[PDB]
Scaffold this motif. Structure first.
Motif, PDB file in Angstrom:
ATOM      1  N   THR A   1       0.835  -1.194   0.000  1.00  0.00           N
ATOM      2  CA  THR A   1       0.000   0.000   0.000  1.00  0.00           C
ATOM      3  C   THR A   1       0.875   1.250   0.000  1.00  0.00           C
ATOM      4  O   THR A   1       1.867   1.323   0.732  1.00  0.00           O
ATOM      5  N   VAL A   2       0.510   2.227  -0.834  1.00  0.00           N
ATOM      6  CA  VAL A   2       1.229   3.495  -0.945  1.00  0.00           C
ATOM      7  C   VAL A   2       0.218   4.633  -1.039  1.00  0.00           C
ATOM      8  O   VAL A   2      -0.796   4.517  -1.736  1.00  0.00           O
ATOM      9  N   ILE A   3       0.491   5.731  -0.332  1.00  0.00           N
ATOM     10  CA  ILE A   3      -0.303   6.957  -0.412  1.00  0.00           C
ATOM     11  C   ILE A   3       0.617   8.118  -0.774  1.00  0.00           C
ATOM     12  O   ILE A   3       1.542   8.446  -0.019  1.00  0.00           O
ATOM     13  N   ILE A   4       0.356   8.741  -1.922  1.00  0.00           N
ATOM     14  CA  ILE A   4       1.125   9.873  -2.428  1.00  0.00           C
ATOM     15  C   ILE A   4       0.167  11.037  -2.627  1.00  0.00           C
ATOM     16  O   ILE A   4      -0.923  10.858  -3.182  1.00  0.00           O
ATOM     17  N   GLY A   5       0.555  12.214  -2.164  1.00  0.00           N
ATOM     18  CA  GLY A   5      -0.296  13.370  -2.325  1.00  0.00           C
ATOM     19  C   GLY A   5       0.400  14.650  -1.930  1.00  0.00           C
ATOM     20  O   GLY A   5       1.629  14.723  -1.873  1.00  0.00           O
ATOM     21  N   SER A   6      -0.417  15.661  -1.656  1.00  0.00           N
ATOM     22  CA  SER A   6       0.055  16.974  -1.253  1.00  0.00           C
ATOM     23  C   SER A   6      -0.282  17.300   0.194  1.00  0.00           C
ATOM     24  O   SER A   6       0.060  18.388   0.665  1.00  0.00           O
ATOM     25  N   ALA A   7      -0.932  16.390   0.911  1.00  0.00           N
ATOM     26  CA  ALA A   7      -1.406  16.659   2.262  1.00  0.00           C
ATOM     27  C   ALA A   7      -0.295  16.362   3.262  1.00  0.00           C
ATOM     28  O   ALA A   7       0.210  15.237   3.321  1.00  0.00           O
ATOM     29  N   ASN A   8       0.081  17.373   4.039  1.00  0.00           N
ATOM     30  CA  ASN A   8       1.016  17.182   5.134  1.00  0.00           C
ATOM     31  C   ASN A   8       0.324  16.461   6.294  1.00  0.00           C
ATOM     32  O   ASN A   8      -0.901  16.317   6.334  1.00  0.00           O
ATOM     33  N   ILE A   9       1.124  16.001   7.250  1.00  0.00           N
ATOM     34  CA  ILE A   9       0.578  15.430   8.495  1.00  0.00           C
ATOM     35  C   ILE A   9       0.390  16.606   9.445  1.00  0.00           C
ATOM     36  O   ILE A   9       1.230  16.926  10.289  1.00  0.00           O
ATOM     37  N   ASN A  10      -0.740  17.283   9.285  1.00  0.00           N
ATOM     38  CA  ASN A  10      -1.146  18.351  10.185  1.00  0.00           C
ATOM     39  C   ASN A  10      -2.649  18.539  10.047  1.00  0.00           C
ATOM     40  O   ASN A  10      -3.279  18.002   9.134  1.00  0.00           O
ATOM     41  N   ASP A  11      -3.221  19.301  10.978  1.00  0.00           N
ATOM     42  CA  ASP A  11      -4.653  19.564  10.916  1.00  0.00           C
ATOM     43  C   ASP A  11      -5.005  20.392   9.689  1.00  0.00           C
ATOM     44  O   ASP A  11      -6.113  20.270   9.158  1.00  0.00           O
ATOM     45  N   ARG A  12      -4.078  21.240   9.239  1.00  0.00           N
ATOM     46  CA  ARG A  12      -4.317  22.052   8.050  1.00  0.00           C
ATOM     47  C   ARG A  12      -4.636  21.183   6.840  1.00  0.00           C
ATOM     48  O   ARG A  12      -5.560  21.486   6.078  1.00  0.00           O
ATOM     49  N   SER A  13      -3.913  20.077   6.670  1.00  0.00           N
ATOM     50  CA  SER A  13      -4.073  19.236   5.491  1.00  0.00           C
ATOM     51  C   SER A  13      -5.033  18.073   5.699  1.00  0.00           C
ATOM     52  O   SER A  13      -5.659  17.618   4.734  1.00  0.00           O
ATOM     53  N   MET A  14      -5.165  17.573   6.927  1.00  0.00           N
ATOM     54  CA  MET A  14      -5.906  16.336   7.151  1.00  0.00           C
ATOM     55  C   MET A  14      -7.366  16.546   7.527  1.00  0.00           C
ATOM     56  O   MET A  14      -8.202  15.700   7.190  1.00  0.00           O
ATOM     57  N   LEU A  15      -7.704  17.643   8.207  1.00  0.00           N
ATOM     58  CA  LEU A  15      -9.073  17.799   8.694  1.00  0.00           C
ATOM     59  C   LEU A  15     -10.078  17.921   7.556  1.00  0.00           C
ATOM     60  O   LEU A  15     -11.253  17.579   7.734  1.00  0.00           O
ATOM     61  N   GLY A  16      -9.651  18.398   6.394  1.00  0.00           N
ATOM     62  CA  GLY A  16     -10.517  18.517   5.232  1.00  0.00           C
ATOM     63  C   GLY A  16     -11.207  19.859   5.155  1.00  0.00           C
ATOM     64  O   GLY A  16     -11.275  20.469   4.086  1.00  0.00           O
ATOM     65  N   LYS A  17     -11.721  20.334   6.287  1.00  0.00           N
ATOM     66  CA  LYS A  17     -12.344  21.645   6.360  1.00  0.00           C
ATOM     67  C   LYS A  17     -11.323  22.771   6.367  1.00  0.00           C
ATOM     68  O   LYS A  17     -11.715  23.940   6.288  1.00  0.00           O
ATOM     69  N   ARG A  18     -10.033  22.450   6.466  1.00  0.00           N
ATOM     70  CA  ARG A  18      -8.985  23.461   6.501  1.00  0.00           C
ATOM     71  C   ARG A  18      -8.405  23.674   5.105  1.00  0.00           C
ATOM     72  O   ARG A  18      -9.104  24.159   4.209  1.00  0.00           O
ATOM     73  N   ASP A  19      -7.137  23.318   4.909  1.00  0.00           N
ATOM     74  CA  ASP A  19      -6.532  23.435   3.588  1.00  0.00           C
ATOM     75  C   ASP A  19      -7.117  22.391   2.644  1.00  0.00           C
ATOM     76  O   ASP A  19      -7.508  21.295   3.056  1.00  0.00           O
ATOM     77  N   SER A  20      -7.182  22.742   1.365  1.00  0.00           N
ATOM     78  CA  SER A  20      -7.669  21.821   0.346  1.00  0.00           C
ATOM     79  C   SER A  20      -6.499  21.017  -0.206  1.00  0.00           C
ATOM     80  O   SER A  20      -5.530  21.587  -0.722  1.00  0.00           O
ATOM     81  N   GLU A  21      -6.580  19.696  -0.080  1.00  0.00           N
ATOM     82  CA  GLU A  21      -5.515  18.806  -0.506  1.00  0.00           C
ATOM     83  C   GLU A  21      -6.096  17.708  -1.386  1.00  0.00           C
ATOM     84  O   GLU A  21      -7.314  17.540  -1.493  1.00  0.00           O
ATOM     85  N   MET A  22      -5.199  16.969  -2.035  1.00  0.00           N
ATOM     86  CA  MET A  22      -5.559  15.813  -2.843  1.00  0.00           C
ATOM     87  C   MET A  22      -4.433  14.793  -2.780  1.00  0.00           C
ATOM     88  O   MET A  22      -3.255  15.152  -2.838  1.00  0.00           O
ATOM     89  N   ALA A  23      -4.810  13.522  -2.668  1.00  0.00           N
ATOM     90  CA  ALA A  23      -3.860  12.427  -2.567  1.00  0.00           C
ATOM     91  C   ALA A  23      -4.419  11.223  -3.309  1.00  0.00           C
ATOM     92  O   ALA A  23      -5.567  11.219  -3.757  1.00  0.00           O
ATOM     93  N   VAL A  24      -3.592  10.188  -3.430  1.00  0.00           N
ATOM     94  CA  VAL A  24      -3.976   8.948  -4.094  1.00  0.00           C
ATOM     95  C   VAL A  24      -3.426   7.771  -3.298  1.00  0.00           C
ATOM     96  O   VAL A  24      -2.294   7.814  -2.803  1.00  0.00           O
ATOM     97  N   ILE A  25      -4.242   6.729  -3.146  1.00  0.00           N
ATOM     98  CA  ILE A  25      -3.826   5.485  -2.513  1.00  0.00           C
ATOM     99  C   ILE A  25      -3.744   4.421  -3.596  1.00  0.00           C
ATOM    100  O   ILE A  25      -4.662   4.285  -4.415  1.00  0.00           O
ATOM    101  N   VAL A  26      -2.632   3.695  -3.623  1.00  0.00           N
ATOM    102  CA  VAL A  26      -2.373   2.679  -4.633  1.00  0.00           C
ATOM    103  C   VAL A  26      -2.112   1.377  -3.893  1.00  0.00           C
ATOM    104  O   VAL A  26      -1.118   1.255  -3.165  1.00  0.00           O
ATOM    105  N   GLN A  27      -3.000   0.406  -4.075  1.00  0.00           N
ATOM    106  CA  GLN A  27      -2.809  -0.933  -3.541  1.00  0.00           C
ATOM    107  C   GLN A  27      -2.410  -1.868  -4.673  1.00  0.00           C
ATOM    108  O   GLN A  27      -2.979  -1.818  -5.768  1.00  0.00           O
ATOM    109  N   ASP A  28      -1.429  -2.718  -4.398  1.00  0.00           N
ATOM    110  CA  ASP A  28      -0.761  -3.496  -5.428  1.00  0.00           C
ATOM    111  C   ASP A  28      -1.459  -4.834  -5.643  1.00  0.00           C
ATOM    112  O   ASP A  28      -1.889  -5.487  -4.686  1.00  0.00           O
ATOM    113  N   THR A  29      -1.573  -5.234  -6.911  1.00  0.00           N
ATOM    114  CA  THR A  29      -2.123  -6.531  -7.285  1.00  0.00           C
ATOM    115  C   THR A  29      -1.110  -7.475  -7.909  1.00  0.00           C
ATOM    116  O   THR A  29      -1.254  -8.691  -7.771  1.00  0.00           O
ATOM    117  N   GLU A  30      -0.099  -6.954  -8.599  1.00  0.00           N
ATOM    118  CA  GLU A  30       0.973  -7.780  -9.135  1.00  0.00           C
ATOM    119  C   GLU A  30       2.034  -7.983  -8.061  1.00  0.00           C
ATOM    120  O   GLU A  30       2.468  -7.022  -7.420  1.00  0.00           O
TER     121      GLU A  30
END
Ligand SMILES: C[C@@H](CN1CCC2(CC1)OC(=O)NC[C@H]2c1cccc(F)c1)NC(=O)c1ccc(F)cc1
Length: 576
Positions: free
Chosen positions: A408-437
């Motif tokens: 499992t991998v998560i890549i994005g622009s969201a820092n580990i802070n309330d600004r990026s994670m709460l959702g109601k604060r800064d607007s961020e976008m990320a992607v989670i990639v789960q592997d099948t091969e």
């Protein structure tokens, strides 16, 4: 009503690709933009039009960002750019300039800035997501802005005095830690970041987020003046970037009413961080610009720091062998005698080691000093020879990356802070990639079937920081092994930190606990200047950029007396 409460479904068997550092990321975004046919969607926290996406500078200005957009916009391609409206007191960002600069190239280029300057409302938060979408079929998500100082390779050079090649031209050569900087006297601050790319229906998911914000901002702008811009439409159910792999991809975001005009705020990035951490069986790799968690329900609220500590306690209980890896900058990226630096250092240390609610506080309260066998906090640093004098600078890790179990991998622009994670604060976008091969790998010495996307990203990540790049890379195959964790990761991180402290007498140091101690420490003789021959020979023992994070830097300094005033009006929740 999707997984993690996200707006985008789980696109099973999609094309995706990870990027370590911007050089490959800027190159593929340039090749993808040049082969655009209909549309190009861009949104950036900071955008610099005159940067080169293909380096070394190849064919004149052919791969300069403004020229790439100019060239495609003249072929009938409709380009839409969405910039963040900086604060009036933000002197460094001038979005009004780049807004006119970009639109003066071709009428097919239309730019919108949010928040609204003319609105009576006051906006505390920003649009920090960085995504480039081409024809709603190829989309790039990560923490890399199309801005000055982002481009870097895996050596993270501090010097650029060639005419042999000059990589960072003009204002692209910058140093945002501690007056236009002198290229021949002061080194640059390298940029370590992580991005990714997706195709197909997952790229259409990324586009729908762009379309929702574009149409939303137009309406909010229309409350004060009519716009000559059009409304955008999602594409209905052709190009591929070389080197992508098939895997399960889902898009995540932090959006609210003020940012995307959504009824109920979304924090799918936050929930995924907790879920991937909670359901990790072996290891977690963290690479983030900020480490602000461990909620107290007063100022900090995101649950990532609590999830990491509680997950280790389960490993200690069930006799499991667990390794966490936390990589953060040695100092926050601000121009000590600062207001944002002291606040962000405080809440970072509060999450890491200072307090009973901190990670190590929760750990020590039940396993004592044996937290060393589970978690490790590190930073990046490198050295170089400039103009005849040895210099050093920390490497700013701006990546927002999470890896777990080589699946499992998560890549994005969201820092580990309330600004990026709460959702109601800064607007961020990320992607989670789960592997099948699956690919044969090692984990805890036994035979492990690891995914191609995740293990490939961890291997590349491990090689850069540990100095096994273009090398046998024989010890780093197993990430959880007692041999790799104790003898390679912690050993390399501890050795390099002491060498730099002995050679350069650099900051941050865990030996300096007060601002008064800071002034005496730096006015002391430096080994790198008084004995260069001994320093150069000692510096040869460094492998990679990994150094151990100082836990006691400015330990005796408190946040409230330094930053507080007699009658303050700025909430503290802005820096968390
Ligand atoms: C090197 C980088 C560090 N910043 C750190 C702060 C922010 C933005 C990047 O960090 C974040 O991630 N989001 C938004 C920001 C933020 C602010 C307060 C609290 C936060 F938590 C986050 N500076 C620049 O790019 C830059 C430098 C000089 C300039 F003239 C123009 C730009």
């Amino acid at each position: 009503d999707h997984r993690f409460g996200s707006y985008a479904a789980i696109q099973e068997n999609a094309l995706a690709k990870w990027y370590v550092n911007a050089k490959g990321y800027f190159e593929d975004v340039a090749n993808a933009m040049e082969e655009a046919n209909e549309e190009i969607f861009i949104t950036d926290w900071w955008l610099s039009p005159e940067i080169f996406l293909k380096r070394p500078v190849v064919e004149g200005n052919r791969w300069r960002l403004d020229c790439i957009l100019k060239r495609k916009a003249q072929q009938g391609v409709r380009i839409f750019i969405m910039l963040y409206k900086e604060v009036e007191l933000a002197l460094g960002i001038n979005s009004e300039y780049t807004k006119r600069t970009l639109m003066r190239l071709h009428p097919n280029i239309k730019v919108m800035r949010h928040p609204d300057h003319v609105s009576s409302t006051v906006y505390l938060w920003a649009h920090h997501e960085k995504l480039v979408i081409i024809d709603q079929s190829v989309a790039f998500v990560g923490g890399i802005d199309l801005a000055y100082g982002r481009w870097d390779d895996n050596e993270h050079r501090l010097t650029d005095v060639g005419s042999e090649t000059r990589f960072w031209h003009g204002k692209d050569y910058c140093n945002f830690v501690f007056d236009f900087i002198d290229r021949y006297s002061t080194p640059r601050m390298p940029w370590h970041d992580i991005a990714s790319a997706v195709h197909g229906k997952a790229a259409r998911d990324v586009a729908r987020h762009f379309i929702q914000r574009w149409n939303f901002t137009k309406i909010m702008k229309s409350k004060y003046r009519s716009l000559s811009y059009p409304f955008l439409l999602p594409k209905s159910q052709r190009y591929q970037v070389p080197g992508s792999v098939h895997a399960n991809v889902q898009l995540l975001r932090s959006a609210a009413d003020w940012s995307a005009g959504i009824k109920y705020h979304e924090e799918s990035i936050h929930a995924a961080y907790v879920h991937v951490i909670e359901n990790s069986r072996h290891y977690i790799y963290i690479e983030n610009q900020f480490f602000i968690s461990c909620a107290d329900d007063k100022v900090v609220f995101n649950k990532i720091g609590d999830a990491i500590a509680q997950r280790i306690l389960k490993a200690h209980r069930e006799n499991q062998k667990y390794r966490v890896y936390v990589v953060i900058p040695l100092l926050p990226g601000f121009e000590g005698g600062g207001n944002a630096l002291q606040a962000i250092m405080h809440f970072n240390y509060r999450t890491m080691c200072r307090g009973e609610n901190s990670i190590l506080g929760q750990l020590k309260a039940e396993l004592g000093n044996q937290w060393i066998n589970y978690i490790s906090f590190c930073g990046l640093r490198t050295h170089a020879e400039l103009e005849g004098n040895l210099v050093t600078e920390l490497i700013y890790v701006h990546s927002k990356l999470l890896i777990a179990d080589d699946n499992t991998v998560i890549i994005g622009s969201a820092n580990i802070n309330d600004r990026s994670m709460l959702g109601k604060r800064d607007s961020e976008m990320a992607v989670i990639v789960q592997d099948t091969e699956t690919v044969p790998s090692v984990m805890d010495g036994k035979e492990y079937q690891a995914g191609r996307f995740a293990r490939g990203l961890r291997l590349q990540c491990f090689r850069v920081v540990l100095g096994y790049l273009d090398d046998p890379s024989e010890d780093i195959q197993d990430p959880v092994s007692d041999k790799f964790f104790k003898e390679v990761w912690v050993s390399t991180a501890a050795r390099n930190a002491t060498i730099y402290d002995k050679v350069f007498r650099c900051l941050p140091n865990d030996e300096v606990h007060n601002l008064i101690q800071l002034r005496d420490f730096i006015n002391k003789p430096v080994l790198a200047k008084e004995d260069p021959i001994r320093a150069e020979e000692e510096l040869k023992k460094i492998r990679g950029f990994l150094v151990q994070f100082p836990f006691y830097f400015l330990s005796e300094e408190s946040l409230l007396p330094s930053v507080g005033t007699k009658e303050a009006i700025v909430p503290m929740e802005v820096w968390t």
